[PDB]
C-alpha cells in the first residue's frame, strides 16, 4: 500500500514522499520514461521494474505487514503479493537513503517532457 511505502520513505530519508519524491526526475511519481537522471531517480526506475514483475498484485493499494525490527525495515509474512510488494517498497526506501548525498532539488518537479530519450529497459 502506497501509504506504507510513504511511511518507509519518511522513516528512511527523514523527508516526506510528497513532494520530495512524488515528482522527481524522470521516474519518481506517476508515469516514467527516458533515462534516470541520477542515483535517486534510478531508485524510482528500479521500483517501477519491481512492481512490473507483480503483474497480478494490487501493488498500490494492497496492505501488507512489515515492521522496524531493530531500526531495520523488515517485511512480515502474508501473501506472495504482500511479501513481494513490501520488498519493492523496502528496497526503494533504502535506495533513497543511500542516494541522499546526490539528491538534487533542481530535479524536484522535473518536466516529463525533458525526459526525451530511449527509455531504459528493466
Ligand atoms: Ca514511476
Ligand atoms: Ca492486504
Swiss-Prot record:
It is an enzyme of class 3 (hydrolase). Signal peptide: none annotated. It is found in: Secreted. Expressed by the venom gland. Keywords: Calcium, Disulfide bond, Hydrolase, Lipid degradation, Lipid metabolism, Metal-binding, Neurotoxin, Presynaptic neurotoxin, Secreted, Toxin. It catalyses: a 1,2-diacyl-sn-glycero-3-phosphocholine + H2O = a 1-acyl-sn-glycero-3-phosphocholine + a fatty acid + H(+). Ca(2+) binds at residues 27, 29, 31, 48. GO terms for cellular component: extracellular region. Its cofactor is Ca(2+). Its EC number is 3.1.1.4. SUPFAM superfamilies: Phospholipase A2, PLA2. PROSITE patterns: PA2_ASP, PA2_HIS. GO terms for biological process: arachidonate secretion; lipid catabolic process; negative regulation of T cell proliferation; phospholipid metabolic process. GO terms for molecular function: calcium ion binding; calcium-dependent phospholipase A2 activity; phospholipid binding; toxin activity. Binds 1 Ca(2+) ion. The active site is at residues 47, 89. Its main location: secreted. Disulfide bonds join 26-115, 28-44, 43-95, 49-122, 50-88, 57-81, 75-86. Belongs to the phospholipase A2 family. Group II subfamily. D49 sub-subfamily. Snake venom phospholipase A2 (PLA2) that inhibits neuromuscular transmission by blocking acetylcholine release from the nerve termini. PLA2 catalyzes the calcium-dependent hydrolysis of the 2-acyl groups in 3-sn-phosphoglycerides. This is Neutral phospholipase A2 agkistrodotoxin.
Amino acid at each position: 500500500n502506497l501509504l506504507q511505502f510513504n511511511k518507509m520513505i519518511k522513516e528512511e530519508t527523514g523527508k516526506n514522499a510528497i513532494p520530495f519524491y512524488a515528482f522527481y526526475g524522470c521516474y519518481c511519481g506517476w508515469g516514467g520514461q527516458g533515462k534516470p537522471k541520477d542515483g535517486t531517480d534510478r531508485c524510482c526506475f528500479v521500483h517501477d521494474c519491481c512492481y512490473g514483475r507483480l503483474v497480478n498484485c494490487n501493488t498500490k493499494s494492497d496492505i501488507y505487514s512489515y515492521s522496524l525490527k531493530e531500526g531495520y525495515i523488515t517485511c512480515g509474512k502474508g501473501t506472495n503479493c504482500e511479501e513481494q510488494i513490501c520488498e519493492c517498497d523496502r528496497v526503494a526506501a533504502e535506495c533513497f537513503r543511500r542516494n541522499l548525498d546526490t539528491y538534487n532539488n533542481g530535479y524536484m518537479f522535473y518536466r516529463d517532457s525533458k525526459c526525451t530519450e530511449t527509455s531504459e529497459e528493466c
